[PDB]
Amino acid sequence: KAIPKDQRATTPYMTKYERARILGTRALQISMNAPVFVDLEGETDPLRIAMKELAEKKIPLVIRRYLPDGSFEDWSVEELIVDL
Amino acid sequence: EEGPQVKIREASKDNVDFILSNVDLAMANSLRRVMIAEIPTLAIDSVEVETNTTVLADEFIAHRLGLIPLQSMDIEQLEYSRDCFCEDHCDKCSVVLTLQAFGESESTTNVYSKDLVIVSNLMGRNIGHPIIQDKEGNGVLICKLRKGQELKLTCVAKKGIAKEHAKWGPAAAIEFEYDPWNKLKHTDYWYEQDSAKEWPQSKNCEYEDPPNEGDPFDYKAQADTFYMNVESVGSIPVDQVVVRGIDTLQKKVASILLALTQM
Amino acid sequence: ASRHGQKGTIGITYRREDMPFTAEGIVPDLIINPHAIPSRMTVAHLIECLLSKVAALSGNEGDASPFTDITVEGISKLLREHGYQSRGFEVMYNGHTGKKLMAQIFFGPTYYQRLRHMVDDKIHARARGPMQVLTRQPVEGRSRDGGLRFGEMERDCMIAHGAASFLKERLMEASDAFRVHICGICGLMTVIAKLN
Amino acid sequence: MIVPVRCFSCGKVVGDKWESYLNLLQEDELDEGTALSRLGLKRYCCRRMILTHVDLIEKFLRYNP
Amino acid sequence: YDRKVPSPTGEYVKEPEWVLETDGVNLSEVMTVPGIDPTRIYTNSFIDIMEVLGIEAGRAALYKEVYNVIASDGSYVNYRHMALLVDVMTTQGGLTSVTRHGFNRSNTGALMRCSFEETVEILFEAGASAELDDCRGVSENVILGQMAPIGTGAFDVMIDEESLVKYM
Amino acid sequence: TLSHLRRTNTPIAKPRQLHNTHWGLVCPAETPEGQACGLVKNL
Amino acid sequence: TTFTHCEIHPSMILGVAASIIPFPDHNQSPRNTYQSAMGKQAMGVFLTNYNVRMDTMANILYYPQKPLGTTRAMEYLKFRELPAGQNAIVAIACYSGY
Amino acid sequence: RGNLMGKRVDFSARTVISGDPNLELDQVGVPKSIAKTLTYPEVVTPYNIDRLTQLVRNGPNEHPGAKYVIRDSGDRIDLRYSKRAGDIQLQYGWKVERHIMDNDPVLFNRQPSLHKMSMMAHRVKVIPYSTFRLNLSVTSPYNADFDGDEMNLHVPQSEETRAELSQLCAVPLQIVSPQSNKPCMGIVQDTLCGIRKLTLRDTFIELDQVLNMLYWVPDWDGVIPTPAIIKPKPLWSGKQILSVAIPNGIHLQRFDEGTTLLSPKDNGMLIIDGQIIFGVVEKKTVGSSNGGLIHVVTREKGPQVCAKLFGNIQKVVNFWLLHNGFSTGIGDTIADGPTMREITETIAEAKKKVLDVTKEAQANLLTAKHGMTLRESFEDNVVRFLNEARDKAGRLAEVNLKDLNNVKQMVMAGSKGSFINIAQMSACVGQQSVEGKRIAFGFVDRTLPHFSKDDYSPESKGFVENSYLRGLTPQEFFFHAMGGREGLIDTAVKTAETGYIQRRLVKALEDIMVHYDNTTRNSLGNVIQFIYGEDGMDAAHIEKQSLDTIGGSDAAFEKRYRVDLLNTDHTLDPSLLESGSEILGDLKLQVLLDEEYKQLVKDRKFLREVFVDGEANWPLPVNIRRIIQNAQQTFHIDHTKPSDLTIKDIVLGVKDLQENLLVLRGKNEIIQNAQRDAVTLFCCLLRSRLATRRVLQEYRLTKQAFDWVLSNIEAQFLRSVVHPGEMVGVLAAQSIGEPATQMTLKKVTSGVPRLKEILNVAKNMKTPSLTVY
Amino acid sequence: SNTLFDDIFQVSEVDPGRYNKVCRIEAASTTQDQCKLTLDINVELFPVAAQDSLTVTIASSLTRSWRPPQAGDRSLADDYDYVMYGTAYKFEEVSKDLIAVYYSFGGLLMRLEGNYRNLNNLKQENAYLLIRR
Amino acid sequence: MNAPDRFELFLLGEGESKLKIDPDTKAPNAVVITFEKEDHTLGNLIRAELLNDRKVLFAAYKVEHPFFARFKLRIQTTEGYDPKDALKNACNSIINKLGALKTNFETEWNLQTL
Ligand SMILES: [Mg+2]
Ligand SMILES: [Zn+2]
Ligand SMILES: [Zn+2]
Questions:
Q1: Strands H132-134 and H12-19
Q2: Contact call for residues H735 and E77 (beta carbons, < 8 A)
Q3: CB B112: neighbour CB atoms within 10 A?
Q4: I need a labelling partner for C149 at 20 to 30 A (CA). Which of F5, G83, H256, J2 fits?
Q5: CA dihedral over J29, J32, J33, J39, signed as positive or negative
Q6: Residue H292 in contact with residue H271, Cβ under 8 Å?
Q7: Would you call E151 and C161 a contact, using CB atoms and an 8 Å cutoff?
C-alpha cells in the first residue's frame, strides 16, 4: 500500500537485525567488486569496509519496513540513527 | 672460590647427594631442569625388524630397545644425524646394533640387552655400549621366546634429548629442597591440631640451624642453600649428569649473546 | 577413569621439567583437579590413594574390600610409620621456578583404567562429499565421509538468534538446494524444461 | 607381559631387576617390601613398577608357534 | 501464614492470619459461604478458576501456577516469557492446550502444523478442503528453502539510486 | 566378559526399583543408566 | 537369639562389576552405578590366547598392572591375572589450569 | 520432520572438547586437521588477489592455503591434482575455496540445543592436536564438561552469512541472557576458587611476581602500581593487582551481613573507578550473578570490553594459583575428635527422642492430628527428628572445619560443593527414602530378612548413621542403594518427558515475534501482546532496582521527599542550594514543590495497589542507582559546597525527561495513550529517584551532573526498548523448557510432572487443593 | 609537598580473626579525647601488642610507575617503620561537629575521628601512612 | 595425528631467529624480546638475574601458551642506558656464575672417594 515519508511511525533507530543485515548485504556487494563509497584507509576486508561505509553513513541502501497488514515504511541508512 | 659454591655430601657411582650454596633459586632449578631434559645422550631410534616370532609385537620390542640405556660419554663428538652431511646416517653420527636370538634351549631363552652387537665403526670412543649394572652381567630383559621362535633386528642409535623424548634423558630423578624449617614461610602447613608433630621432619634440617621462637619474622631473607641429589641411569657418570648440566645450560645462555650479536 | 565414575579426559601433557615435584624427587603421571570431589562425594577414590601409597611402600597388597574392619585412622598410622605425612599430602615445588607450593597436595598412587573411545577415532570433518540417493542430502556417519546434523533444535536456535540468512544457508546452499520449474497456471513441477 | 624397562613416573632403569627380585622370593625367601629396598627401589614411583607388573608373557610363551 | 501489611503507622508488618486449605475442588459454592473472603479465595485448578471467575482471571491463575513450577526449583524466569506463553494459551477464547488437540488445529496454514504430530493426517485434509497457505510461517519457508520473515528478514533492503549519486 | 554372562533381562508394577527381596540375589549398584534402567539386572 | 542362618560374607550381595570397586561402602550410592558401566569400556587382556584370535576389533594394554588397592572378591574374578589398568602416581591439585 | 525441518549438512565438523585457559572467551581452538579440511569460498578481489594467489600457490596440504579454485565458467579446479596446480593466474570474479583461518567466525554448538546460547559464534584459532579448545567461562552456556563430551562446528559461507554470526551470534553478545535478565557466563573452578584466595587481606604479593602478573594482563598500561606496603619490604595485596584487570569507571557496592564501610569480616564488596577497595571477591562478585561485576562491565563499558575481562582476570588469577598451589584429600573430610563423639551422641540423643515416641504410640497415647492416620502422624515426626538430627550433626562439622580446610574453601568461593556434601562425608549420611516413605516392608513386616518383624525403629526403615568417611553397613549400604537407585530412574524420565514439553512449547510459539508496530503477533496477525512483555523492553536490558517510594513508614517518607519552602525546618537549608536563602517563602515555587509531592504521594498508593506484598525490588530498564554513581565521581562532586540548580531546573526537567522516554510512537490518542501506560511503572521509580530533596541532599548533583544524568537515562532507556525483529516466541518457549531440564528431583503435585499437567490442560490433577481466606 | 597529620596513640586491643598475618587495631589519642583510631596492620613486618606508643602521620608526598631501590641515597620520608599507601573512600559525619574519614590500602582499612583537619585532610587517593617505634 | 613433531621444541624452523626485539610503546625506554624455541628453563633465569641490575626498572617474562615453545620477556631501564645492553650482562653474569660452579663442583668431586 505504501506510506508517506511523513505520518511515519516506526522506530527512528536502526534495529540490530537491520544493521546486521545491512553490513552483511553491503559486504557481499563490496566483496563482489561493487563500488566503494568511502576512502579505504587501507582496509581490505569487505565487512570491514562495510563497517566504514556505515559510519560515514554513506551506504546507498533503504530498509523497507513491512507492517503486519502489508503496508510498509521506507527508511534510509542515512536517516536511521545508529546507537547499538 | 668466587661465587656459588658446593659441599658434596654422600657420593657414589649412581648418586651425588650434595649442597649448592649461594645461588639464586631460579638458578638451582634452571639447572635441575637442564639436567633432566637437555643433556645430549645416545640411544636406539630406528629398529629394522628382519624376523620375529615372539609374542611381543614388533613395535613393542621396538619401544623397549629405545628405553635400553646405551653408552654415551664421548657423545660430545658424534654429530646429530640432522647435521651430518650423509644421506640418512653414518659412522660419523650413528651407532648400529644387531640382535639375533633362537629358541634352541628346550626351556625359554632370555633376550637381554647384553645380546646386542655393535657393527658400525666406533672410531675408538666410549659410546653405543649397552650399559650394564646387573649383578650377573646381562642387564635389562628385552623379551623371552619358546620352541623355534626367532628375532633378527638391527638398530641405529642417534643423539637426541629428553625434549625429543625421555628415552634419551640421563636424569631419571633428582632430589630438591630448601629452607627445611619453613623460615621464608614458602608454605602454610595444613593440620588438625599442630603442624610441628603431624608434618614430619627432613633429614636436611640438621645442616641448617633451627628456629628460635621469640625472633620476629625475617623478611629480607632470600634463598641460599639447596639440598639436591642427582641420581642417574648410567649413560653418564653421575658427575657429568651434573657438570654437562651446568655446561649445556651455560652454552644456551651464550647463544643468546651470540644471537644478540649477529643482530 | 579411576574406579569411582571419575571419567575425565586429557587436556594437556607436560614433562618433569614443567611438572610439579616433591623433594623426594618423585613427580606425578596424572594431575586431576581438586574440584572433581566435593559433590561427587566419592571418598573411596580418595582413600584408595592412601591405602595404595601405603601398600606401595610395604608391598602388602592393600585390602580395600567392602565392609570390613579398616579405617582411615588405622592407615594414617601405617603411612606415618613410613615417614610421609599421615594424610597423604606432601610438599611440592612448582616445576617452572622451583619455588615451593604454598599449599600441599594430596599425592599418591591410584588405579586408573584407560577406557576406549579415543580422539583420533572421532575427530571428523566434512565439506561436501558423499550424497544420499533418495534425498540427495549428505550421508550419515563419520565412517562414510558423511556430514553432521543441523536438526530441529539447532534450527530453533537460529530462529531465536533471528539469524535469517544463515538459517537458509545451512538449509539450502549447504545441503539440498535444487532448481525446479513450474507452471504459472497449475502450480506443479510438470513443466518439461529443455534448458538448451 | 614382560617387565617394564624403566619407571614411568621417575625414569630409573628397572628392566633387569626382574629375575633378581623374583629370586629374592623363591630362594632367599623374603617379604616384598624389603626385597625391593635391597634391589635399590626406594621411592614408591619406581617401586610400584615391580610390585605390580604381572608377567603374562610366561603365559603367552606357553602356547605353540 | 505470614502476610505482610500496612501498619496504621505506615510501616509494613507481619500480621499473620489463619487460613484453610482444601483437598477437593468445588469453587462455585465454597465461594458463596459465610465467613470467608470471596475476593481472595484461590484454587490451583485454573480450569475451575476460569469457568467461574472468568478467563481474564483464569490467565492470572494459569500464569501464577506456572510461575510456581519454576520458582519451586529456585530458578528465575522473567515474566514476559511465561507471560507470553500463558497468553498464547489464552487469547483464542478459553484454555487452548499446548498439544496436538489444541494449538495445532488453529487457522495456521497446513505446512506449519504439518511439522508436528499429525503430519500426513493433517496434509490429507488440506487438499481435501483446498486450504491455502500464506507462507508467513517460519516452518513454511524453512521447508521451501526461503529466507523466512524473522529478525534479519522482517524487511527488505533497497538501492536508492538517488542517494547513490550524492555519494561520489 | 564375566559380567555379561551373569546378566538378566525383563520385558515391558514398579519394577525398575530396587526391591528388598532383590537382596543377596541381584546386585544393587550394577545396572545400565537411563533407558532400560532396572529392567536389566546383574546377578 | 533366634538367628536361623548367617551370611557367609555381606560383600556377596554385590555382582561382578561392583566387586572391583574399592571401598564401595564410601561412595554416594550412584557413583558406583556408573563405575559399574565404565569398567566395561576399559582395556586390559580379555584372554591370553589373543595372539591367536581373529575377532573384529580388540584392545590390549601394553603393560597391565594388578591394582594396589584390592578386594578379596577379586581372587575369584581372576583379576591379578588379567588386570585392566595401571597404578599411576596421581596428584590431586590445580596447576596450569588444563 | 527429519529431512526438511532439519538436515545433514556440509562444512561441518565435530570432535572432543577440552578446556584451555589461554584463549579469549570468544575464540575456539580448531585443530589444523580440520582447518585444512573445512573451506571457505572467497571471491577474488584486488583487495586480496595477492594473498589469495599465495594460498592457491601454497596448495591444499600446507596449512594457510586453499584447495579449490573456481572460475566464471562454472568449473572446479581441484588443487590437489590438475597439471596446473602451481600455475594459475587468478581472475577478479573467480572464487577460491580456501582453508578456514585465524578469525573466520564460525557457529559452535553442543547438543541438546535448547538455548539461543546452545549455539554461539567464536573466533577461529587454528591449533595443533585434535580437540576443539574452548574457553572455560563459555562452558556453562553450552552446558558442557570435558569428560569426553563432543561438540559441533558449522562454517558460514556467504560474506553476509558470516555477518549474521558476528553481529548477532558472537559470544560477547550472549553475555547477558534475557531468559533471566542477568549475565549467563561467569568464572568457575580454578579461576573462581583461586580468585578468592588471591584477594584476602591476608594475601600479600612481592615484587618479583607482581611484575610477572602485571605482564600477563595484556592491556596493562605499563605502570607498576604503587605498593600498599612500603615500610621494610614493598609488598602488594592480591586485591591490588587483580584490580589491574578491572577497567576504569566501574563501580560496585555490596554489603552482605556484617558490612560497615570497614567490613571487619571483609564482607560486602566495593569497587571504585575500577579498583577493589575492600571485600573478598567470590561467586557473588565475579560469577553469573544479578548485580555482578560482569553484569556491570557489560552494560557499562561494552560487550567487547567485558569479554576481554574474563580473559585478563583468568590469566592473572590462573598464573598466580598456578604457583600458590591448591588441592584436597581425606584429611579435609575429618573433623575434630570431640566434635565426632559430640555428634555420635547428637545422633543417639535423637534415637531416644524417637524411641520414646515409638512406645508413646505403641500404647495408643498419641492424638490423631486432623486429616492424618495415627500411622501417618507417627512417621511425620520420626523423619522430622532424624533429619533434624542429620542436619545439625552437619552444622557441627561445618563449623569445626577450619578456614584452611580445602573443601570448605571451595565451598566459600562457591566453586564447588555445598553444605549437604560436607555433612554426608564427614558427619552423618542421612535417612534413605522412596516415594517419601522410608524404606518399606517388601519382606513381610520388615525391611531385610536380617530383622525381627514389626521393627519400626530407624536402623531398619532406612537410616544411615555413618558418614561416607566411616562407611555404610550392609543394611545401610543396600537401603542407600534402593533409594539412590530411585534417582537414576526418574532422572531418566525427567529427561525424556522434559524433552517433549520443551519441544511442544517451541512448536507452539515459533511464529510469534515482535512486529514493527511494537505489537506481539503470530503468523496470522493475531495480536497476542499489544506490547511485548506489557512494557516493550528487551529482557536483556533489565536489573533489580528498588522502588523506595513504596517501603517505609508514612513518617520517613515526609522527612525524605517533602519540601516546604514556607517553613524554617522543612525548607532546603541554603547549605545545599545556591539560591537557598532567597527561596524560603517564595509562593510560586511552593506550588511546583507541592505538585511534585502530591504526585510522589499518588505514586505510593498506586504501587501499593499493584505490588500488595510490599516487595520493592523489581526488574526494570535503565539502572538509575548506577547511572548516578558515575555522575558522582565523574565530576568529582564535593559534598561540602552547595549546588546550583534552580528548583525549576530540577522539577521542570524531570518532567521533560519522561516526555522523551518513548516506547510506542503513534500520532493519535489510542496509541499515544498506551504510551503513558507502558511507562508508568518506570516513571514512579524515576520520580522517586529524582525528587528535589533527594537530588540535593543525598547526591549533591550540580546542574552539569544532573543534565548529564538526564541525557544518559533517556538514551540508556531508548536502548532497552525491544527491537522489532526479535523472534520472541521461540525465545519465551526455550526460556521455560530450558530450566525445565535442569530440574533434578509441602506435599502437593510440584515440578516437572506438574508442568506436564498444566500444559495439557488436564482436568483430573492428582492434587486439586484450594486455599480460602 | 607538605605533611597532613601528627599524633601518638595507644593500642586498646589487637585482633587476629583467622588472619595468620594481619590484625586489625584500635587505639586512642594522647591529647584530644576525641581522636580514636581503627587501622588494619600487617603484624608480620611490624609486630604490635596491646598498649603501645605508635606515632601516626599522613601527607601526600615523599602517579607514574613506582621506582625500585637506587634511592639508597635519595629522598626518604621513611624515618618510620611502617609506611602504607592507599585511598580514602568516604567522609562520614559522626553527628555533632565530628568528622571521620575511612581509608583503604588495597585491603587494609582505616578509620579516623576528630574535627580539626577541616583543611588538612584532602579527599584524594594520594595519602601515604606512617608509623614509628 | 595433529600432534606436532616432537623436535619443534628446540629446532628453529624456516626463517626464524632465537630473538625478535619489538620496542614497547606502552611506556618509554622498555622492550619486548621474543625468545623462540625456548621456555621457562632459560626464561625465568634470565629474568631473575635481570632483576638485579639496579638499572632495571622492570622485568618479567611469560610463556604465551603451553602448546608452543617460546616466550616473551619485557625489560625496562633508566634513560640513557639501553636495555639490550642490560640483557647482555645479565647473561654474562649467569655464565660466569656457572663458570665458577662448573669448577668448584669438580674441585669437590676429585676430592671424593667412591
Ligand atoms: Mg557428560
Ligand atoms: Zn651421518
Ligand atoms: Zn620411579
A1: parallel
A2: yes
A3: 22
A4: J2
A5: positive
A6: no
A7: yes
**What is the DSSP secondary structure assignment for residue E114, as one 8-state letter?**
I
List the one residue out of G39, C20, C10, C85 whose CA is nearest residue H330.
C85
C49 is in an annotated binding site: no
Cell of J96: 660466569
Query: Which triple of cell numbers denotes residue B5?
Result: 659454591
Q: Which residue range(s) make up the domain with I80?
A: 1-133
DSSP H8: E
The CATH number of A1-84, from 3.90.940.10, 3.40.50.720, 3.40.50.1820, 3.30.230.10, is 3.90.940.10
Domains along chain D with CATH numbers: 1-65 (1.10.10.60)
Distance CA H749, CA J6 (A): 61
In which element (H, E) is residue C44 found? Answer: helix C43-54
- Which amino acid makes up residue H555? A
Q: Strand locations in H443-489, DSSP E?
A: 463-464
Q: How many CB atoms sit inside 10 A of residue H187's CB?
A: 29
Instruction: For residue C83, give the nearest of B173, B179, B200 by CB distance.
Output: B200
Facing D44 at nearest CB: one of C16, C57, C60: C57
Pairing of strands B117-118, B95-98: antiparallel
d(CA E154, CA J35): 53
What Cα–Cα distance (Å) separates residue A36 from each residue in E156, E161, H268, H320? 21, 15, 54, 49
All residues of chain B having their beta carbon less than 8 Å from the beta carbon of residue I44 are: 217, 219
Show the DSSP H helices in D1-65 as ranges: 17-26, 32-39, 44-52, 57-61
CB neighbours of residue H304 within 10 Å: 13
Strands B117-118 and B20-21: unpaired
Any idea what DSSP says for residue A14?
A: P
Q: Please give the sequence-ordered ranges of beta strands (E in DSSP) within chain B, or none if there are none.
A: 5-6, 20-21, 43-47, 51-52, 95-98, 109-112, 117-118, 141-145, 151-152, 155-158, 174-175, 229-230
User: Of how many residues is chain E composed?
Assistant: 168
Q: Omega before H264 cis (within 30°)? A: no
DSSP 8-class letter at H115: S
Main-chain phi, psi angles of E25, to 5 degrees: -145, 110
Count of structural domains within chain J: 1
Mutation target vs C (from E133, E138, E152; most C CBs, 10 A cutoff): E152
Please name the method used to determine this structure: X-ray
Asked if H402 contacts H408 with a C-beta cutoff of 8 angstroms, the reply is: yes
Q: Please, what is the Cα angle at H61 between H57 and H66, to 5 degrees?
A: 50
User: What is the domain range of residue J97?
Assistant: 1-114
CATH number for B245: 3.30.1360.10
Residue of chain C with shortest Cα separation from D48: C56
Calpha distance C152→C166 (Å, rounded): 15
Return d(Cα J93, Cα J98) in angstroms, integer.
8
Query: Terminus-to-terminus CA distance in chain G, angstroms?
Result: 59
Nearest CA distance, G92 vs chain C (angstrom): 5
Of E80, D45, H187, which Cα lies nearest the Cα of B231?
D45
Count of residues for chain G?
A: 98
Resolution (A): 3.8
CA nearest to J2, candidates C159, E25, C125, H762: C125
The angle at the Cα of H47, spanning H46 to H52, to the nearest 5 degrees, equals 85
Q: Is the dihedral of CA B13, B15, B17, B23 positive or negative?
A: positive
Please judge whether D44 and C109 are an interchain contact, meaning their C-beta atoms are less than 8 angstroms apart.
yes
CA angle in degrees (0–180, nearest 5) for E110-E111-E113: 65
Question: In the numeric block, which cell numbers belong to residue B38?
Answer: 637437555
